[PDB]
């Protein structure tokens, strides 16, 4: 039901993104390849892992226009602000990191799916000539997550995650 690090990379390859670089917060120490983030425009980050825990949480960094970066936490805005300060220090100088203001209570333990799905839609929404406000991007994310769960999304995503976990270790 949880997406492994290799499973995340395999997902983006099958989606036509090639070989991606991801990030992590391992034992409290972040590893963010900002050159790859600038080139990819996004980066899934596996947090909450370390020497005594292999099961954590997926979040998504997003590069906007100019020097703007965004953090999409599937657990909601306040969960994302817990990572904002340590992840901001990893960005190039002159950058600003903003947490996408989406609602809480909709992750359902499917952060790997939300990052690879809603996170990319948030990436395209923020990287266009006339983008909606940051308030509107988070509200769209909250509504889409809630609408997918309303359409039996938990049973469909957990089933799809078990399939991907079966085609890999």
């Amino acid at each position: 039901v949880e997406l492994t690090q290799e499973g995340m990379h395999a997902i983006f390859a099958r989606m036509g993104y090639g070989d991606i670089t991801s990030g992590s917060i391992y034992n409290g120490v972040p590893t963010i390849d900002t050159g790859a983030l600038n080139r990819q425009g996004f980066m899934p980050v596996l947090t909450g892992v370390g020497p005594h825990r292999d099961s954590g949480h997926w979040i998504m960094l997003i590069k906007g226009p100019g020097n703007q970066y965004y953090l999409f936490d599937p657990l909601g805005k306040t969960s994302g602000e817990g990572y904002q300060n340590i992840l901001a220090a990893q960005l190039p100088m002159g950058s600003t990191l903003s947490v996408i203001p989406n609602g809480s209570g909709l992750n359902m333990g499917l952060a790997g799916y939300w990052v690879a799905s809603a996170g990319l839609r948030a990436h395209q929404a923020l990287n266009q000539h006339n983008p909606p406000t940051l308030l509107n991007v988070g509200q769209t994310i909250t509504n889409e997550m809630r609408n997918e769960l309303d359409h039996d999304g938990y049973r469909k995503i957990t089933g799809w995650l078990r399939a991907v976990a079966d085609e890999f270790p």
Binding site: E2, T31, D33, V49, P51
Partner: protein
């Protein structure tokens, strides 16, 4: 000799090894530099996963070769 171990997170780890080093010893060396327990490590070279009980010479790993390190971690 020096070898390079590349993670999926972009980091490159340089290791001092000998061709007769076992895979378990190479994993233990990675733990001393990065702190990752060997149970979390998957070592890859030439599209092959290195098995415990064998040595680097069994896979024809030379000086300044590049290995890949996938970690047994997940999230939800």
């Amino acid at each position: 000799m020096q070898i390079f171990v590349k993670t999926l997170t972009g980091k490159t780890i340089t290791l001092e090894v000998e061709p007769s080093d076992t895979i378990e010893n190479v994993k233990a060396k990675i733990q001393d530099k990065e702190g990752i327990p060997p149970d979390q490590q998957r070592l890859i070279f030439a599209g092959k996963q290195l098995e415990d009980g064998r040595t680097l010479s069994d896979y024809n790993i030379q000086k300044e070769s590049t290995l890949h390190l996938v970690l047994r971690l997940r999230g939800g």
